Amino acid sequence: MSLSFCGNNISSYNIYHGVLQNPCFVDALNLVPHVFLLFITFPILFIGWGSQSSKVQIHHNTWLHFPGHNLRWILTFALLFVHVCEIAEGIVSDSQRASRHLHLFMPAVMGFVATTTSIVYYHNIETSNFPKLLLALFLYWVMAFITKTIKLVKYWQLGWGMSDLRFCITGVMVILNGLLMAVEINVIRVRRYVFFMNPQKVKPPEDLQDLGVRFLQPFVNLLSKATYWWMNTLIISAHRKPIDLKAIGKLPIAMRAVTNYVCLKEAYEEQKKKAADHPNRTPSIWLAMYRAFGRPILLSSTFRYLADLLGFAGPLCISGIVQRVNEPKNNTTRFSETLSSKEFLENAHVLAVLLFLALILQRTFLQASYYVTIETGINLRGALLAMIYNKILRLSTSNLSMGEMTLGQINNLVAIETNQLMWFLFLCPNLWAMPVQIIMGVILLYNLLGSSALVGAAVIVLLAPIQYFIATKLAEAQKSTLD
Amino acid sequence: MLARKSIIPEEYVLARIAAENLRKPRIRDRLPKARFIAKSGACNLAHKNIREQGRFLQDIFTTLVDLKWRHTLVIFTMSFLCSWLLFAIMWWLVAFAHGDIYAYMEKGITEKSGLESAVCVTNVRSFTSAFLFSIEVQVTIGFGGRMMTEECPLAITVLILQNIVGLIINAVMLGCIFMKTAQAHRRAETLIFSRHAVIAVRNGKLCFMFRVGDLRKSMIISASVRIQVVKKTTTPEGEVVPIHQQDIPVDNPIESNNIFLVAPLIICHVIDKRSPLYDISATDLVNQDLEVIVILEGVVETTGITTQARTSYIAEEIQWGHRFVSIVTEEEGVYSVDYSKFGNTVRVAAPRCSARELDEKPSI
Amino acid sequence: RLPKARFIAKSGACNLAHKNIREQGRFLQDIFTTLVDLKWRHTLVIFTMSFLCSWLLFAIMWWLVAFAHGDIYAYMEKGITEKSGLESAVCVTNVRSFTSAFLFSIEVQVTIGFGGRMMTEECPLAITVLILQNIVGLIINAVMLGCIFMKTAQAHRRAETLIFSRHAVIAVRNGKLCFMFRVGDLRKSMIISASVRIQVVKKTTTPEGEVVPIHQQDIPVDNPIESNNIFLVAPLIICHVIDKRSPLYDISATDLVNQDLEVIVILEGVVETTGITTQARTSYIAEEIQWGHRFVSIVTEEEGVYSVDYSKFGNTVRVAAPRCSARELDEKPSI
Amino acid sequence: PLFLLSTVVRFAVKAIISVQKLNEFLLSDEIGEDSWRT
Amino acid sequence: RSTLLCLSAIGMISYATPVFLIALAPLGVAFYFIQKYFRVASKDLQELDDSTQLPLLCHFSETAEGLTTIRAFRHETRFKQRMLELTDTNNIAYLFLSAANRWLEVRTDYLGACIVLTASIASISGSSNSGLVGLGLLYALTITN
Numbered sequence A: 001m002s003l004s005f006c007g008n009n010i011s012s013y014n015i016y017h018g019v020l021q022n023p024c025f026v027d028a029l030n031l032v033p034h035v036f037l038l039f040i041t042f043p044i045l046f047i048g049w050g051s052q053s054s055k056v057q058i059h060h061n062t063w064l065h066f067p068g069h070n071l072r073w074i075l076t077f078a079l080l081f082v083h084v085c086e087i088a089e090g091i092v093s094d095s096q097r098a099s100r101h102l103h104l105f106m107p108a109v110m111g112f113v114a115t116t117t118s119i120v121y122y123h124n125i126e127t128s129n130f131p132k133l134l135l136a137l138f139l140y141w142v143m144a145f146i147t148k149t150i151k152l153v154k155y156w157q158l159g160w161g162m163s164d165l166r167f168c169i170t171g172v173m174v175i176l177n178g179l180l181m182a183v184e185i186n187v188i189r190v191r192r193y194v195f196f197m198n199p200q201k202v203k204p205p206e207d208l209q210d211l212g213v214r215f216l217q218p219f220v221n222l223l224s225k226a227t228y229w230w231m232n233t234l235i236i237s238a239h240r241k242p243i244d245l246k247a248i249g250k251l252p253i254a255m256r257a258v259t260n261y262v263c264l265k266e267a268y269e270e271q272k273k274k275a276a277d278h279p280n281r282t283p284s285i286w287l288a289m290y291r292a293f294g295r296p297i298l299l300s301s302t303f304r305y306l307a308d309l310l311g312f313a314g315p316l317c318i319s320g321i322v323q324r325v326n327e328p329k330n331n332t333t334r335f336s337e338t339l340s341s342k343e344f345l346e347n348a349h350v351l352a353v354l355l356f357l358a359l360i361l362q363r364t365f366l367q368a369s370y371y372v373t374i375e376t377g378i379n380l381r382g383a384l385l386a387m388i389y390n391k392i393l394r395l396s397t398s399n400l401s402m403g404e405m406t407l408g409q410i411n412n413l414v415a416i417e418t419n420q421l422m423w424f425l426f427l428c429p430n431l432w433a434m435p436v437q438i439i440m441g442v443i444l445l446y447n448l449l450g451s452s453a454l455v456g457a458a459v460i461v462l463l464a465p466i467q468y469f470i471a472t473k474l475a476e477a478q479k480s481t482l483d
Numbered sequence B: 001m002l003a004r005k006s007i008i009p010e011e012y013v014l015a016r017i018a019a020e021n022l023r024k025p026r027i028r029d030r031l032p033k034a035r036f037i038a039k040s041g042a043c044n045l046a047h048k049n050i051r052e053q054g055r056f057l058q059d060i061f062t063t064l065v066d067l068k069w070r071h072t073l074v075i076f077t078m079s080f081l082c083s084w085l086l087f088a089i090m091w092w093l094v095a096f097a098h099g100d101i102y103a104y105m106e107k108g109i110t111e112k113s114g115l116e117s118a119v120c121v122t123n124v125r126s127f128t129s130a131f132l133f134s135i136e137v138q139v140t141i142g143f144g145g146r147m148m149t150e151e152c153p154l155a156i157t158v159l160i161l162q163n164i165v166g167l168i169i170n171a172v173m174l175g176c177i178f179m180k181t182a183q184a185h186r187r188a189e190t191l192i193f194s195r196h197a198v199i200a201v202r203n204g205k206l207c208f209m210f211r212v213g214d215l216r217k218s219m220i221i222s223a224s225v226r227i228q229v230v231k232k233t234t235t236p237e238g239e240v241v242p243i244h245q246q247d248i249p250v251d252n253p254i255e256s257n258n259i260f261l262v263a264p265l266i267i268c269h270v271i272d273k274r275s276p277l278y279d280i281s282a283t284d285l286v287n288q289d290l291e292v293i294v295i296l297e298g299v300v301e302t303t304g305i306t307t308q309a310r311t312s313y314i315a316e317e318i319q320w321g322h323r324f325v326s327i328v329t330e331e332e333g334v335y336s337v338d339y340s341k342f343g344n345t346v347r348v349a350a351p352r353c354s355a356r357e358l359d360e361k362p363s364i
Numbered sequence C: 001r002l003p004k005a006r007f008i009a010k011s012g013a014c015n016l017a018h019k020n021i022r023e024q025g026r027f028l029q030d031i032f033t034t035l036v037d038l039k040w041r042h043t044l045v046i047f048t049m050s051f052l053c054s055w056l057l058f059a060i061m062w063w064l065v066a067f068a069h070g071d072i073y074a075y076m077e078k079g080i081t082e083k084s085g086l087e088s089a090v091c092v093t094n095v096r097s098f099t100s101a102f103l104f105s106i107e108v109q110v111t112i113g114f115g116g117r118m119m120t121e122e123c124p125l126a127i128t129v130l131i132l133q134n135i136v137g138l139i140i141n142a143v144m145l146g147c148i149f150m151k152t153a154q155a156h157r158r159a160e161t162l163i164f165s166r167h168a169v170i171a172v173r174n175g176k177l178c179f180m181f182r183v184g185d186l187r188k189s190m191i192i193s194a195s196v197r198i199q200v201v202k203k204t205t206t207p208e209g210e211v212v213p214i215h216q217q218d219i220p221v222d223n224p225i226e227s228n229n230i231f232l233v234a235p236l237i238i239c240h241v242i243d244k245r246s247p248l249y250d251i252s253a254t255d256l257v258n259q260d261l262e263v264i265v266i267l268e269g270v271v272e273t274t275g276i277t278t279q280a281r282t283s284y285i286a287e288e289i290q291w292g293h294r295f296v297s298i299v300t301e302e303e304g305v306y307s308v309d310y311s312k313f314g315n316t317v318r319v320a321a322p323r324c325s326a327r328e329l330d331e332k333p334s335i
Numbered sequence D: 001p002l003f004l005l006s007t008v009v010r011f012a013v014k015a016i017i018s019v020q021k022l023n024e025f026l027l028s029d030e031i032g033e034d035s036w037r038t
Numbered sequence E: 001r002s003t004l005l006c007l008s009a010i011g012m013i014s015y016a017t018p019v020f021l022i023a024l025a026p027l028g029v030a031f032y033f034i035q036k037y038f039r040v041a042s043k044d045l046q047e048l049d050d051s052t053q054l055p056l057l058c059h060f061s062e063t064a065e066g067l068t069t070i071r072a073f074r075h076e077t078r079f080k081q082r083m084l085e086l087t088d089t090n091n092i093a094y095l096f097l098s099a100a101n102r103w104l105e106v107r108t109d110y111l112g113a114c115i116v117l118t119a120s121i122a123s124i125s126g127s128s129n130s131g132l133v134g135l136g137l138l139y140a141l142t143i144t145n
């Protein structure tokens, strides 16, 4: 009939034994902090703080980041995911009932919108340096923590254990709220903007001070670093005025050729000083490249492994959806208990959402890997060209060192060898990431089709050697054609 | 996928026609000279490395009082709606916790019971009722079908909170509306500046004349005229100031800056010895470091708010050797101003030399 | 020893000490004026306390009038008798305690009027209390709205934003010594009708014996049309040229360390946003005047725009200058 | 990945050869030791 | 090959479950805009890369045929502070090209994921053989690729 909250059963509103011992009241108390946050933060965002109290014609050009920035974004996205899961479970459970139990999923939907608004509020605070305001966020997190904690202990008093899905989801939410509160506390500690007498002295990065730096990848928030959103303007400026050399303005001081040349020179000097004391040891460029461009390759491999792991969500979700849609649900008897932690993954509508999220996460991870390794390869190429030039300047004109074909060797070394080395540094992660993916694919094939999958894998795997042979013959033909 | 990984064919791509013949290097793509004050009367520099003084919570309020009428209404409505909702949630929670929702459900199942002796707030039984009660307490309607009893003191605490918060919000919103009502004539600026500034001859000496006029019907009290020249100058001891502003007097029979502006006026500065433009000739006024700023200030008699209107002229805008056509011409029995002829200029004959040279051989 | 007495500190705020003033009487208008200009942290507190105190005071009054009449007794015996023997005898219906009196006072003064505690027409004293409560509530409500209106009105104005360089210079500019300092603005708006005035505070003696403790002498600032009005968008260098009548005529370079000087700079104007006239002050003493320096340039052209660089605002580089008093450079022209 | 493995391996071989050439070029006679004393 | 695979895939998606193609109209719209803007910027970006590599090689050749002259004039730093500028222009051309490619790949991957969702949800609530659910899933997944 009517649209209640704790359901249509009278005895579900009893508050005899205690308010906490009534689960619906704990759900309402969980619903409260989200609406408090929304009502505090919607007016603040709508009003703005655009009071022109200072020269902002070159203050809008620069911005800043607070201490915990990437960790905050990663935690808020994880919390968004956990809330999506809670919404889904609540809806599924409610559809197995008589009435509409709004206390299963309305708190989760409010939490979803509140967390989204929390990250919007944090960004709009950070872009215009204003740490005092984020005190509001502080309060939010603390309150949320408390409320969620209560839910947990009341589950724990019934001994629900980790075998029940809701207990696991609530525990994850508790620890994520705790981590976010810790992030806020550390921000207060490092910036000293409330309870201290002397705040900090912070200035934007030196690169945004210059008006010619138009490559804004290192200077933007993690959700724009991950979608290349900052690029939009330039690309949409391809209609009004065709791109010139001026639009791609300049390089940030961290990616210029001089800095990377300094790094590579110092690494090579460390290697050579170590080797000179050694009696009969030859120089090595390989180890000079490592220890100077080795961290970003590890980061690329990490993103690559995460993308490769998430990639398998296609076959698994497909199998689940198909093997669920086979049998009509008329036969099954009524079950009023909360859905099992395995019956959550057994659904036909949960798995579609899981596949969707898995795809949009795998693609982002893959593109992050590509971009990081590309940028590393380009910086290494710039350093190599600088080094080769500085060696060219210090050369002898004697005919016992020079030769009838020496400018040709130099021309090749600048026009071909550098490009080949760079395009290897791009595809370096595929060396130790492809085997993992192929092995895991064969494992899944076996565990899905028996020992016929071994025959199928044996057939397909031969694709690489055949392509190698064809490639070699093709290269020889191309060489003759070029001659 | 992997478009041009194979990278052999290069280093011998012959020079293009524009490369070898040197037709491309004819760039002729110089950036325009940097202005100091725009033509739209807005100064456009770029101050940098200014120590950020943070923000203050007062800035949010300062913004709130100064907003468009299409945002004042929205914030008005949102504030009131949010307040009613927040306190509705509080009242519904109080009703839940005290055991009033359950009591009403059980005594309305058999509604003949009709017992409401022990309830925090009478006749509140769902969330719709809580919302209606919060509306009747914040707006002070008070129908009285949902009373506040003397039973539970948490309810009284929430009632006190709600009355005070409602009063605070009401006072703030009336203050905002009244402030926007007091600033009702404060719209904009309507001082019209000629586009090209001629350099004519008047009474045997050159000049630098432009035209200025009004659009608002309200008079301007104690109008004032300032004219400056912006250029980089060096002292004989050799200190270079990139942007030096030098003040140039304005012609006036009693040596004053007071202009009485009802009909449009011509503002002339005569090129005497100390004038910055003493040593400039018509052939020099093609490429030249020269920006002349004009600043007119006054008070509009209606609002009594000081107004300052600025403009700037560069070497391209100046029309050496012209003058201004007479905008004003008498009608049948009343003076008339044809504002369509405001910036229109006529051409006349003037010496091509500089005043630097026009008074060393005067008989020319 | 003790720092020498100043006239105006490095942030204005004249450091004098007026004493023996014939003190006047303290008026309630001072209390009201203090009330109308306050900080939000205190405005909110006085706002809340006024209403709480008024509700409580009239709650006490209503409880007393329910006590003096036979009201509390009637409503306490009705429960025993199980019959409404107290419907019409009551001074104010259904007020039977102090909590109910407090609720009724809230309803009357905030003008809710739920109507469970109605105003009967028997006891005239209650009608008197009701009229009194309505008038008092109206007065308090009007006062508090007036305070909030004043806050909103004077909300826009904020703190000072004129930046002055820490210490001045004495250079040679166009063949004469000039005392120079630099003034800049951090505000976004335009100081309409600005103006600059310079004074020298010094103890002077007259030939007739009239000794003036701190005499203020007016210094003609140097402008090419002999006026004060300064237009301020990029930071300016205010200058003064030391001529035959400037008090800085006879002060040499060596003995600038120990000389009773103080240069006060007063800069006035009218802001554009709110039209509230402002005045900013500063002062320089002997220790903070650097002979023979000059300010470095600050504005560079980025080929699209000019770009002031405020990091170098107070920088000042050393150059050459005749290391002698301004009298000797013309009475002894050869130098 | 099976298709791209061949290109990755080929690029590895060419990169090895390229680093060899780079080491050979970096070991060459140079002019100095008279301008080094300032 | 790519366009025929995409066309056949969306055709079978629509035929197996018609409700998808009503959702086709928005997605296609989005695609068109992408296929516009990239293609306009990409050319320009390429027109810089191939243009900023020709001088960078030329410079080297000069400083290889006239090293004695340069070391005579002692103009070495004047040439190094130029080589650095050349290589930085070239590198920024490459970086902006790669960023444009990554922008395109992210956008089209999100479009593919939206296609996957709007096909899987239609197929989950449908009346057809499990074969025409599996076909829909697999082809709407390959479209992403």
Ligand SMILES: CCCCCCCCCCCCCCCCCC(=O)OC[C@H](COP(=O)(O)OC[C@H](N)C(=O)O)OC(=O)CCCCCCCCCCCCCCCCC
Binding pocket: A065, A066, A067, A068, A069, A070, A071, A074, A075, A078, A081, A082, A172, A174, A175, A178, A179, A182, A183, A186, A218
């Ligand atoms: C009950 C629990 C209560 C807990 C008790 C208290 C615990 C205390 C811990 C909290 C400490 C918070 C301090 C923050 C650390 C800041 C360190 C420092 O800032 O450098 C961190 C570095 C530097 O980048 P940045 O400073 O953040 O600023 C960004 C800017 N662009 C810049 O790099 O200059 O930035 C980085 O280096 C990025 C680091 C990322 C680390 C995240 C790892 C990923 C793990 C994935 C987890 C996913 C979430 C969970 C998933 C669950 C799924 C259901």
Ligand SMILES: CCCCCCCCCCCCCCCCCC(=O)OC[C@H](COP(=O)(O)OC[C@H](N)C(=O)O)OC(=O)CCCCCCCCCCCCCCCCC
Binding pocket: B067, B068, B069, B070, B071, B073, B074, B077, B078, B081, B187
């Ligand atoms: C979580 C919650 C979600 C909330 C969702 C959003 C809720 C929104 C609900 C209402 C939205 C209304 C927005 C409509 C926008 C139309 C604005 C319209 O009034 O413009 C008319 C103007 C707007 O001037 P401006 O552009 O702001 O510029 C400021 C100034 N002119 C300047 O240039 O500097 O404005 C004015 O000029 C003044 C208008 C005054 C208003 C009229 C009041 C009438 C009183 C007078 C009595 C007349 C009789 C009325 C009776 C009507 C019968 C019903």
Ligand SMILES: CCCCCCCCCCCCCCCCCC(=O)OC[C@H](COP(=O)(O)OC[C@H](N)C(=O)O)OC(=O)CCCCCCCCCCCCCCCCC
Binding pocket: A039, A040, A043, B057, B058, B061, B079, B080, B082, B083, B086, B160, B161, B164, B165, B168, B169, B172, C038, C039, C040, C041, C042, C044, C045, C048
């Ligand atoms: C759901 C909401 C939706 C609706 C919202 C929309 C907007 C409507 C409401 C508008 C709110 C009112 C605007 C307040 C403006 C903020 C001003 C802010 O500056 O003051 C907050 C204070 C700062 O103190 P301050 O430095 O002295 O400020 C004055 C400033 N120096 C000046 O220039 O002059 O910061 C502080 O430093 C904190 C110190 C204490 C301040 C507050 C004390 C609280 C006292 C009592 C408040 C509670 C009221 C209820 C009590 C009930 C009792 C039963």
Ligand SMILES: Nc1ncnc2c1ncn2[C@@H]1O[C@H](COP(=O)(O)OP(=O)(O)OP(=O)(O)O)[C@@H](O)[C@H]1O
Binding pocket: B192, B193, B194, B195, B196, B339, B340, B341, B342, B343, B344
């Ligand atoms: N009749 C008019 N009404 C309003 N504004 C005018 C009028 N005449 C000139 N102006 C103002 O003069 C400024 C310069 O305009 P513009 O350069 O187009 O022509 P002009 O030199 O003013 O005269 P004309 O329009 O006759 O050529 C503009 O900002 C415009 O607002």
Ligand SMILES: Nc1ncnc2c1ncn2[C@@H]1O[C@H](COP(=O)(O)OP(=O)(O)OP(=O)(O)O)[C@@H](O)[C@H]1O
Binding pocket: C020, C021, C022, C023
């Ligand atoms: N200490 C003071 N505080 C305020 N006002 C003063 C003070 N001393 C003098 N005045 C003002 O100065 C004026 C002095 O004139 P008055 O008629 O008082 O002469 P007086 O009493 O001889 O002065 P004094 O006693 O100061 O020598 C008066 O108008 C008075 O208002």
Ligand SMILES: Nc1ncnc2c1ncn2[C@@H]1O[C@H](COP(=O)(O)OP(=O)(O)OP(=O)(O)O)[C@@H](O)[C@H]1O
Binding pocket: B049, B050, B051, B052, C163, C164, C165, C166, C167, C186, C310, C311, C313, C314, C315
């Ligand atoms: N870049 C800037 N941004 C904001 N304010 C500034 C800036 N530079 C100077 N100021 C202000 O100008 C005043 C004069 O500073 P000046 O440059 O003469 O000495 P300083 O070395 O900056 O001294 P301090 O380090 O104490 O500011 C200082 O009080 C400071 O508040």
Ligand SMILES: *[C@@H]1O[C@H](CO)[C@@H](O[C@@H]2O[C@H](CO)[C@@H](O)[C@H](O)[C@H]2NC(C)=O)[C@H](O)[C@H]1NC(C)=O
Binding pocket: A009, A010, A011, A012
């Ligand atoms: C509504 O009330 C309770 C929920 O706690 C459900 O359990 C019944 O409650 C009564 C006590 O009033 C018990 O004696 C019964 O054994 C319970 N009946 C069961 C488990 O079937 C109750 O089922 C709920 N639903 C109704 C009454 O329809």
Ligand SMILES: [K+]
Binding pocket: B142, B143, B144, C113, C114, C115
């Ligand atoms: K009533």
